[PDB]
């Protein structure tokens, strides 16, 4: 009886860690919309919101959001899916042309600068014989002067023909559920005080992820996932200064953002079935686009994040916040998309703080670009059409992406700059819970029975 | 070892239970293992990876004694150099997640012995039919 006999069991619950390609899914209301008014509405399978999960008792798996897969997959898929909604669109090959630009009709102040140029140019008509003269309004950031006369051109006339974003398709975020195929499972960590590294004591298997609205924001990640009860700072290694610190806080900070300029979309016929949507008139006042946060709740959340930052840096540490050190436009000033319109809003009023170890609203100004170079490709820019009317939107500041400066030579303080950098830090703040595992049956074990011949 | 209870008893539910108790729910993980302009290629290769993995596991079973038993016994004895531990301290103490690591090194030594014993039993059966 002390001789045991081996038995192989099929259907054994045991998994290894694996790397597979998850597939996209949308909600049934997201599956309800059609005709590619958003991206890829019929390409993904419909599913429920908050997909079904069951809890696993007495189990402990070690997680790591930093060496995690499927943030690479989501980054690659969102880049490629961004590209695939541009092949039916219109290339601005005939618009790379000499722009005769004068100032906008406005009370010009010689100290400041007009941020709009009224540019007239020859446009090819729908007939290949006749050309017309048409004007438009551009921003300073989209045109550059080529070398009396004052003729300009676009900044991307020497790198690419610039694909117009189609005004039919919208750029609003709709939640993706990343579903696993057969044989694979997805584990979610329900632990409260879990920094995304090491053993999670409370996991649950789930077939699809929860809803991930794709937001594109460099600093101050918007409409994210709130923390449970306190602010949680998350980093791969704190003492490394070239790692970003992802700060997720509990109650969100309400931000309002607006362009108060009432615009006139005007159509220009390029060729047969080719339309360019330009700016017509500025109906009314020429005002500057901006954003508001609440002064009191922003001071409150900064006190909360300093309270949580003093756990990794000692109690007697002076924590101060300064603005970004430099770079391109959309790594220093916080970018977003307020309904088909790309804002670049100055954060110098936000990160202006110092913290000792003892009804208002912040206005912060914005710039607007019409042509963009998303993900810094070699030859793919994107014109974005103007949209009608005053544009306002409300959002939730969910977290921050901070970066500590290279503190040396007896740093009594430690300072923190905002910084966007890679988009994957935006994507790692939503897939920090989940991992994907390979379920492997056919366990093998001894028991006291020989097969009867 | 099964009783009356109304909870769902779902896929990977008893992954943390002891392996004498997860053996009473093995048809659940066996069931939820197969069924679940460019993206159809990705979905399609995921589906054929799923059916290929299922066929590989069913082929590993089929060249052994059990083809559809889901619990089968065989004629190779448990070499005590493999795990050197008692019978009482596996079925009431450890899980399959923890028993997987303890014989992962001795895996693929066992599978060749399983195929060897099944081929020897097939030729013994053929000779026993042949002498009659």
């Amino acid at each position, epitope marked *: 009886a002390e001789n045991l006999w081996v038995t192989v069991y099929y259907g054994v619950p045991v998994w290894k860690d694996a790397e597979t390609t998850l597939f996209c899914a949308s909600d049934a209301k997201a599956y309800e919309t059609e005709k590619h008014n958003v991206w890829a509405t019929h390409a993904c399978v419909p599913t*429920d919101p*908050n*997909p*079904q*999960e*069951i*809890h696993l*008792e007495n189990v402990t798996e070690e997680f790591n959001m930093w060496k995690n897969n499927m943030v690479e997959q989501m980054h690659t898929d969102i880049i490629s899916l961004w590209d695939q909604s541009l092949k039916p669109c219109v290339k601005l090959t005939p618009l790379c042309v000499t722009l005769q630009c004068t100032n906008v009709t406005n009370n010009i102040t010689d100290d400041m600068r007009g941020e709009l140029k009224n540019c007239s140019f020859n446009m090819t008509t729908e007939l290949r014989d006749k050309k017309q003269k048409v004007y438009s309004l551009f921003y300073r950031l989209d045109v550059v002067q080529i070398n009396s006369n004052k003729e300009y051109r676009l900044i991307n006339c020497n790198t690419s023909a610039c694909t117009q974003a189609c005004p039919k398709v919208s750029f609003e975020p709709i939640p993706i559920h990343y579903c696993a195929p057969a044989g694979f499972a997805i584990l979610k960590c*329900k632990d409260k005080k879990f920094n995304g590294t090491g053993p999670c004591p*409370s996991v649950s298997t789930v077939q699809c992820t929860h809803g991930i609205k794709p937001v594109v924001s460099t600093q101050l990640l918007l409409n994210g996932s709130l923390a449970e009860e306190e602010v949680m700072i998350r980093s791969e290694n704190i003492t490394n200064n070239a790692k970003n610190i992802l700060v997720q806080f509990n109650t969100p900070v309400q931000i309002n953002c607006t362009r108060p300029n009432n615009n006139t979309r005007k159509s220009i016929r390029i060729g047969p079935g080719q339309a360019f949507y330009a700016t017509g008139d500025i109906i009314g006042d020429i005002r500057q686009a901006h954003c508001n946060v609440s002064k009191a709740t922003w001071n409150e959340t900064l006190g909360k994040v300093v309270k949580q930052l003093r756990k990794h840096f000692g109690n007697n540490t002076i924590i101060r916040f300064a603005n970004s050190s430099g770079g391109d436009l959309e790594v220093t000033t916080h970018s977003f998309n307020c309904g088909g319109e790309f804002f670049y809003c100055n954060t110098s009023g936000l990160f202006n703080s110092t913290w000792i170890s003892n009804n208002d609203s912040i206005t912060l100004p914005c710039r607007i670009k019409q042509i963009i170079n998303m993900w810094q490709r070699i030859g793919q820019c994107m014109y974005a059409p103007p949209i009608q009317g005053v544009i306002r939107c409300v959002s939730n500041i969910t977290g921050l992406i901070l970066t500590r400066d290279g503190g040396s030579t007896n740093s009594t303080t430690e300072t923190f700059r905002p910084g966007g950098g890679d988009m994957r830090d935006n994507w790692r703040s939503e897939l920090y819970k989940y991992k994907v595992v390979k379920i492997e049956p056919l366990g093998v074990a001894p028991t006291r029975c020989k097969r009867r011949v | *070892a*099964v*009783g*009356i*209870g*109304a*909870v*769902f008893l*779902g896929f990977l539910g008893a992954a943390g*239970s002891t392996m004498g*108790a997860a053996s009473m729910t093995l048809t659940v993980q066996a*069931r*939820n293992l197969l069924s679940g302009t460019v993206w159809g290629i990705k979905q399609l290769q995921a589906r054929v990876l799923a059916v290929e993995r299922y066929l590989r596991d069913q082929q590993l079973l089929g060249i052994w004694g059990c083809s559809g038993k889901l619990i089968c016994c065989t004629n190779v004895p448990w070499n005590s150099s493999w795990s050197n531990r008692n019978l009482s301290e596996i079925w009431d103490n450890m899980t399959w997640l923890q028993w997987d690591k303890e014989i992962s090194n001795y895996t693929q030594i066992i599978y060749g012995l399983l195929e060897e014993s099944q081929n020897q039993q097939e030729k013994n059966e053929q000779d026993l039919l042949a002498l009659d």
Partner: antibody
Amino acid sequence: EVQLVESGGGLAKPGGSLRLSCAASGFTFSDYYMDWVRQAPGKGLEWVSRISNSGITWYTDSVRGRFTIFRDNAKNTLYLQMNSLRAEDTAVYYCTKESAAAIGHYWGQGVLVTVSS
Amino acid sequence: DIVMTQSPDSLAVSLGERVTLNCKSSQSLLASSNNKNYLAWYYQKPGQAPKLLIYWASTRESGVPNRFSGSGSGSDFTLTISGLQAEDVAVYYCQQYYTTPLTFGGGTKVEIK
């Protein structure tokens, strides 16, 4: 005909301990899962624990290994031991019998536990 | 976890006419394998141990007469009464028993107006 009659204690200092038992008459303990469900005074009912036919325990995520459940199949009773009591444990406790269709098929009478000094 | 939310907080009606109550779930409780759904509709009197009314999200318990109906599948569920009695006017509950932790509804206290 099947009664689940409970016993134990009701008077406990905050930060203490108590053991609550449940005898049952009407069925066999060999094949039925047991539960423990509490109700706060004026608030909703809530689940605490569940035990299998052979001793596989399931706990809610607040009792976190402070409460244990032991079902003496020989002495035909169900046991809930409470170590390191908390002030929010003042409730009425119930042992139930589970059917295969819905849990809480039959219902214990309750023990009013007041964790107060 | 799974949040079970009952849509009204109370319902004070007259006696004799029908009513209806709803319980929404934060997660679809419809088991795809069994093709059957997981609600326990309970009934607790004042000062009494509760009893089951509806199991498998549709089926009445023995001892319960024909005047109740558990209805609906998927994620949103409906307990419809056909005739109100004086024995019935106390708290109803909805319970998911699909996973651990077993969570209940808020409790709609139906009384007489």
